[PDB]
């Protein structure tokens, strides 16, 4: 239960703050869980997603064991586009359908030096918690 008197739990305030969030806060909202192997490798549960992560859809119509790279992180409708996650219009042209990253499992990251810095920071804070608990 929240005890902080400066953090609001008001539903309309939380919804306004979510739907009017600027893009660098949107990046943190558009975060996907890593795979089980990526969790045991990097000790990181969740990561903001980027334009090159090879991911899996696990909820929706396009769920399954197939793997596709993210091709676009469309932060304004809070969706991402994955390679073979597409549907065809009336005229025969394929368009990409929006998938929320919470329904998305990352199986291969784009490892930049910024990404490695963020991964080390999250792993170190998790281990600070684990070695504070005992």
CA atoms within 13 A of residue 51's CA, in its CB half-sphere: 3
84 binds RNA (CB under 7 A): no
Give the one residue of 36, 41, 59, 74 binding RNA; rule: CB under 7 A: 74
* Residue 3 or 129 with smaller CB distance to RNA: 3
1 binds RNA (CB under 7 A): no
3 binds RNA (CB under 7 A): no
108 binds RNA (CB under 7 A): no
């Amino acid at each position: 239960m929240k005890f902080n008197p400066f953090v609001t739990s008001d539903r309309s305030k939380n919804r306004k703050r979510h739907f009017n969030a600027p893009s660098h806060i949107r990046r943190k909202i558009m975060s996907s869980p890593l795979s089980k192997e990526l969790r045991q490798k990097y000790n990181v549960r969740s990561m903001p997603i980027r334009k090159d992560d090879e991911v899996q859809v696990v909820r929706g119509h396009y769920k399954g064991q197939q793997i596709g790279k993210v091709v676009q992180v469309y932060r304004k409708k809070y969706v991402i586009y994955i390679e073979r996650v597409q549907r065809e219009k009336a005229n025969g042209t394929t368009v990409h359908v929006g998938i929320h990253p919470s329904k998305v499992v990352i199986t291969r990251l784009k490892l930049d030096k910024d990404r490695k810095k963020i991964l080390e920071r999250k792993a170190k804070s998790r281990q600070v918690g684990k070695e504070k608990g005992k």
